[PDB]
Write a protein that holds these residues in place. Structure first.
Motif, PDB file in Angstrom:
ATOM      1  N   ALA A 151      -8.087  15.163  12.703  1.00 14.04           N
ATOM      2  CA  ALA A 151      -8.208  16.356  11.868  1.00 14.04           C
ATOM      3  C   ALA A 151      -7.529  16.127  10.524  1.00 14.04           C
ATOM      4  O   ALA A 151      -6.309  16.145  10.430  1.00 14.04           O
ATOM      5  CB  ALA A 151      -7.575  17.554  12.570  1.00 14.04           C
ATOM      6  N   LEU A 152      -8.323  15.929   9.484  1.00 19.33           N
ATOM      7  CA  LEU A 152      -7.781  15.623   8.168  1.00 19.33           C
ATOM      8  C   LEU A 152      -7.160  16.868   7.571  1.00 19.33           C
ATOM      9  O   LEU A 152      -5.985  16.888   7.197  1.00 19.33           O
ATOM     10  CB  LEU A 152      -8.894  15.153   7.241  1.00 19.33           C
ATOM     11  N   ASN A 153      -7.992  17.891   7.447  1.00 19.62           N
ATOM     12  CA  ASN A 153      -7.572  19.181   6.945  1.00 19.62           C
ATOM     13  C   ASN A 153      -8.485  20.244   7.543  1.00 19.62           C
ATOM     14  O   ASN A 153      -9.202  19.978   8.516  1.00 19.62           O
ATOM     15  CB  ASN A 153      -7.641  19.204   5.413  1.00 19.62           C
ATOM     16  N   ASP A 154      -8.459  21.436   6.956  1.00 21.23           N
ATOM     17  CA  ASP A 154      -9.330  22.527   7.371  1.00 21.23           C
ATOM     18  C   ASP A 154     -10.789  22.083   7.393  1.00 21.23           C
ATOM     19  O   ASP A 154     -11.558  22.484   8.268  1.00 21.23           O
ATOM     20  CB  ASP A 154      -9.173  23.716   6.416  1.00 21.23           C
ATOM     21  N   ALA A 155     -11.159  21.259   6.418  1.00 20.62           N
ATOM     22  CA  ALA A 155     -12.559  21.089   6.050  1.00 20.62           C
ATOM     23  C   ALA A 155     -13.147  19.793   6.618  1.00 20.62           C
ATOM     24  O   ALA A 155     -14.368  19.631   6.647  1.00 20.62           O
ATOM     25  CB  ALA A 155     -12.707  21.113   4.536  1.00 20.62           C
ATOM     26  N   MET A 156     -12.288  18.863   7.035  1.00 24.35           N
ATOM     27  CA  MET A 156     -12.725  17.486   7.254  1.00 24.35           C
ATOM     28  C   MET A 156     -12.210  16.890   8.556  1.00 24.35           C
ATOM     29  O   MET A 156     -11.069  17.103   8.942  1.00 24.35           O
ATOM     30  CB  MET A 156     -12.287  16.580   6.103  1.00 24.35           C
ATOM     31  N   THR A 157     -13.059  16.080   9.184  1.00 24.22           N
ATOM     32  CA  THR A 157     -12.677  15.272  10.329  1.00 24.22           C
ATOM     33  C   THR A 157     -12.958  13.800  10.026  1.00 24.22           C
ATOM     34  O   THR A 157     -14.001  13.462   9.465  1.00 24.22           O
ATOM     35  CB  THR A 157     -13.490  15.659  11.575  1.00 24.22           C
ATOM     36  N   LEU A 158     -12.008  12.949  10.403  1.00 17.50           N
ATOM     37  CA  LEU A 158     -12.068  11.524  10.131  1.00 17.50           C
ATOM     38  C   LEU A 158     -12.349  10.779  11.442  1.00 17.50           C
ATOM     39  O   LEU A 158     -11.690  11.017  12.447  1.00 17.50           O
ATOM     40  CB  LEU A 158     -10.720  11.093   9.533  1.00 17.50           C
ATOM     41  N   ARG A 159     -13.352   9.901  11.408  1.00 13.42           N
ATOM     42  CA  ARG A 159     -13.824   9.144  12.578  1.00 13.42           C
ATOM     43  C   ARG A 159     -13.754   7.644  12.222  1.00 13.42           C
ATOM     44  O   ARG A 159     -14.040   7.279  11.087  1.00 13.42           O
ATOM     45  CB  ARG A 159     -15.275   9.539  12.913  1.00 13.42           C
ATOM     46  N   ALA A 160     -13.305   6.800  13.151  1.00 13.64           N
ATOM     47  CA  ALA A 160     -13.368   5.353  12.957  1.00 13.64           C
ATOM     48  C   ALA A 160     -14.370   4.722  13.908  1.00 13.64           C
ATOM     49  O   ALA A 160     -14.505   5.141  15.073  1.00 13.64           O
ATOM     50  CB  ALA A 160     -12.003   4.729  13.164  1.00 13.64           C
ATOM     51  N   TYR A 161     -15.061   3.696  13.400  1.00 13.04           N
ATOM     52  CA  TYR A 161     -15.945   2.865  14.205  1.00 13.04           C
ATOM     53  C   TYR A 161     -15.559   1.392  14.053  1.00 13.04           C
ATOM     54  O   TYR A 161     -15.238   0.949  12.961  1.00 13.04           O
ATOM     55  CB  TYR A 161     -17.386   3.002  13.725  1.00 13.04           C
ATOM     56  N   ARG A 162     -15.704   0.626  15.126  1.00  9.93           N
ATOM     57  CA  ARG A 162     -15.756  -0.829  14.997  1.00  9.93           C
ATOM     58  C   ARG A 162     -16.941  -1.177  14.101  1.00  9.93           C
ATOM     59  O   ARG A 162     -18.022  -0.610  14.251  1.00  9.93           O
ATOM     60  CB  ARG A 162     -15.955  -1.481  16.360  1.00  9.93           C
ATOM     61  N   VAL A 163     -16.736  -2.130  13.202  1.00  7.18           N
ATOM     62  CA  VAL A 163     -17.826  -2.734  12.453  1.00  7.18           C
ATOM     63  C   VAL A 163     -17.671  -4.254  12.457  1.00  7.18           C
ATOM     64  O   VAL A 163     -16.558  -4.772  12.651  1.00  7.18           O
ATOM     65  CB  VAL A 163     -17.896  -2.206  10.999  1.00  7.18           C
ATOM     66  N   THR A 164     -18.788  -4.973  12.298  1.00  4.70           N
ATOM     67  CA  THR A 164     -18.731  -6.433  12.227  1.00  4.70           C
ATOM     68  C   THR A 164     -19.542  -6.933  11.036  1.00  4.70           C
ATOM     69  O   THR A 164     -20.466  -6.257  10.563  1.00  4.70           O
ATOM     70  CB  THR A 164     -19.214  -7.101  13.531  1.00  4.70           C
TER      71      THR A 164
END
Ligand SMILES: Nc1ccn([C@@H]2O[C@H](COP(=O)(O)O)[C@@H](O)[C@H]2O)c(=O)n1
Length: 127
Positions: free
Chosen positions: A70-83
């Motif tokens: 939960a970044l803030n009220d407005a935003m959610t941060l998601r991580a993915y593996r990348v190659t």
């Protein structure tokens, strides 16, 4: 919520981390690179776009890495593996990049949001 996607690029046994240059509060601190999803984009589209722009690389987007933040009220941060598919990363928007191993993760000066993923990143680099 607006989704912000971020990439955990692991190559030859090391993780890429990126040192932000802005805003002042985060400049000098380290993150998984990425950015906002635009309406109509998949998470994969968005993350591949951001890493091509930020790093000059073509990546494939894989499984999630860790949990939503939960970044803030407005935003959610998601991580993915990348190659890596093609290219060598360079800091077009960032102050610096670094390739780090498992034992360097928890000592990095992470941006507050991303610091949540430290245990997940250590695990991904361990074994
Ligand atoms: N790894 C990341 C990437 C972005 N962010 C946040 O996502 C928003 C958009 O990312 P950029 O500033 O990188 O475009 C910013 O508010 C930034 O603080 C983050 O907290 N962790």
């Amino acid at each position: 919520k607006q989704i912000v996607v971020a990439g955990a690029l692991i190559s030859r046994g090391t993780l890429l981390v990126a040192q932000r240059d802005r805003p002042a509060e985060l400049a000098g601190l380290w993150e998984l690179p990425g950015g906002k999803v635009t309406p109509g984009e998949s998470d994969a589209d968005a993350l591949a776009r951001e890493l091509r722009e930020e790093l000059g690389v073509d990546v494939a987007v894989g499984e999630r890495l860790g949990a939503d933040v939960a970044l803030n009220d407005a935003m959610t941060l998601r991580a993915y593996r990348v190659t890596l598919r093609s290219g060598s990363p360079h800091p077009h928007d960032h102050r610096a990049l670094r390739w780090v191993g498992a034992d360097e993760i928890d000592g990095l000066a992470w941006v507050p949001a991303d610091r949540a993923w430290v245990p997940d990143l250590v695990a991904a680099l361990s074994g």
